[PDB]
């Protein structure tokens, strides 16, 4: 067992991109000496993500807050591999507002470091936390100066960034609130945050075969049938959007993993509506649990019908910060 981003780029139809035969841009190298790294963010079994300051890598913030992913000094030649291999599906995807973006990497000499955006207030799952008893105000919804409009603006970014991954040929396959980070300005950031993970010792990681899955966040066709596609990522987007609006429940509570639960989703149950869910978004929920997967909305669907639920000067604030990020360079 290694770690392994989970991401999966389709090459075709009748097959995944290999990312080892992907090439390197070197454009992404980025001198050691202008990296300062700082305090861990998340320690796996493998590896860890560490705040750092870059100095230089932009030139409009020539001093900037960064997120660095590495692996234990101890990495074997193939541990190397994978993260080259992330580094590769990275610069293959290209960047969007709502996913953690690659900024440059260190790969000359010495460990392999992946420099990303930095999330000021960490992952979805904590911030539900810290904020849940908490649970200008439609204009600050994206800004940094907990409501409704906040979970429904998470669930519409969360659409946004999906929707740009589909639109890629790339599935998640571990889409979950752990893996969507929440940066400056209340910006969604969906991303694979495993580096900082031990799926051996994680409730949400069940043993299934020779590896650790999140199967209560799985659709029935790759928990059965090891079918993993843009539909199966639309399931676990339901899931999703139960820990959201949950504000950082567990999905199906009180209940194991076992046999038992596999036939049981199998058979038709499905999580009943959480507390703080309103029925338009219970429904979509419930569209996107569909047993059928083509039944499922597209993440291009699910963004139009969530941006029909929040206030219309929400869409225009949000496209003024998705303007500024494309013209920053």
């Given at each position: 067992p290694r770690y392994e981003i989970r991401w999966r780029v389709i090459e075709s139809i009748s097959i995944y991109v290999d990312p080892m035969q992907l090439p390197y841009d070197s454009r992404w190298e980025f001198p050691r000496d202008g990296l300062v790294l700082g305090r861990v963010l998340g320690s796996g079994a493998f590896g860890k993500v560490v705040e750092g300051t870059a100095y230089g890598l932009s030139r409009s913030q020539p001093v900037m807050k960064v997120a660095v992913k590495m692996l234990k000094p101890t990495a074997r030649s193939s541990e190397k591999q994978a993260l080259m291999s992330e580094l590769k599906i990275m610069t293959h995807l290209g960047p969007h507002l709502n996913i953690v973006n690659l900024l440059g990497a260190c790969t000359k000499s010495g460990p392999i470091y992946i420099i990303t955006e930095y999330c000021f207030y960490g992952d979805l799952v904590n911030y539900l936390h810290k904020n849940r008893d908490s649970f200008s105000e439609v204009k600050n919804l994206l800004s940094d100066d907990l409501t409704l409009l906040d979970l429904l603006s998470f669930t519409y970014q969360v659409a946004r960034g999906m929707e740009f991954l589909a639109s890629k040929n790339c599935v998640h396959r571990d889409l979950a609130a752990r893996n969507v980070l929440l940066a400056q300005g209340k910006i969604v950031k969906i991303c694979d945050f495993g580096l900082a993970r031990d799926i051996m010792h994680d409730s949400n990681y069940v043993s299934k075969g020779s590896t650790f899955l999140p199967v209560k966040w799985m659709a029935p066709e790759s928990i059965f049938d090891n079918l993993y596609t843009t539909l199966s990522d639309v399931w676990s987007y339901g899931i999703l959007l139960w820990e959201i609006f949950s504000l950082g429940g567990t999905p199906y509570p009180g209940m194991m993993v076992d046999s038992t639960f596999y036939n049981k989703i199998k058979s038709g149950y499905r999580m009943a509506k959480p507390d703080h869910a309103t029925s338009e978004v219970y429904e979509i929920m419930v569209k996107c649990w569909n047993?059928?997967?083509?039944?499922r909305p597209s993440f291009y669907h699910l963004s139009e019908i969530v941006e029909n639920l929040l206030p219309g000067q929400y869409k225009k604030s949000y496209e003024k910060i998705h303007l500024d990020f494309l013209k920053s360079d």
């Open positions: 047993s059928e997967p083509e039944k």
